[PDB]
Chains A and B, each alone.
Chain A
């Protein structure tokens, strides 16, 4: 299953990265009652909240974040949203290692480095979700943008496990 594992890792990395940039770029993270200028149903993202019913259909402005040191640190991280963006870079760095993996067969650390990048990126997503949820709370529903980030975490962990498996079996074959 050596061929399918590499194809799974290469396909999975592209799926995890593409879902991440769409989740960050799009603004359907949360459905809430608010104003995009009375208040109406709105769909909120990481940077913009926009109403989806009423006379202001589709028109919207940037989300303000700053309206208590612990609250300031949570708001600063949430306003910057570095963790979801950090997960985008780690997928990008992890994808490059997998692409460069099929070039340098002699160096077996490049594929393991990709595995660490995918595993580390998933930890940046769950910490990004907790920061986003905690700041949101401090009725609603989650759109497909939030679930894209949730599904980008599961795929990143699965590809990381497969990437580590590929490296481990290579050292097992070298030891044999």
Chain B
């Protein structure tokens, strides 16, 4: 019986957790280098 939330099976639960962590880290760094510079803003 294909269990619900089975579409996450191809990637292990470790990858899904680290993808969320990587997404948050990239977003903060991209904001940091694009907003903190007086020359850029």
Q: Is the interface of B mostly helix, strand, loop or mixed?
A: helix
The reply to whether B28 and A160 contact each other, CB–CB distance below 8 Å, is yes
Q: Count of chain B residues with Cβ under 8 Å from any Cβ of A?
A: 15
- A9-27 CB mask vs B (1 if < 8 Å, else 0) is 0000000000000000000
Q: Is the interface of A mostly helix, strand, loop or mixed?
A: helix
Bound-state CA distance A157–B21 (Å) is 10
> Chain B nearest CB: distance from A142 CB in Å?
9
B residues near A (Cβ < 8 Å) are 14, 17-18, 21-22, 24-25, 28-29, 31-32, 35-36, 38, 41
A residues near B (Cβ < 8 Å) are 112, 115-116, 119, 122-123, 126, 129-130, 133, 150, 153-154, 157, 160-161, 164, 167-168, 171
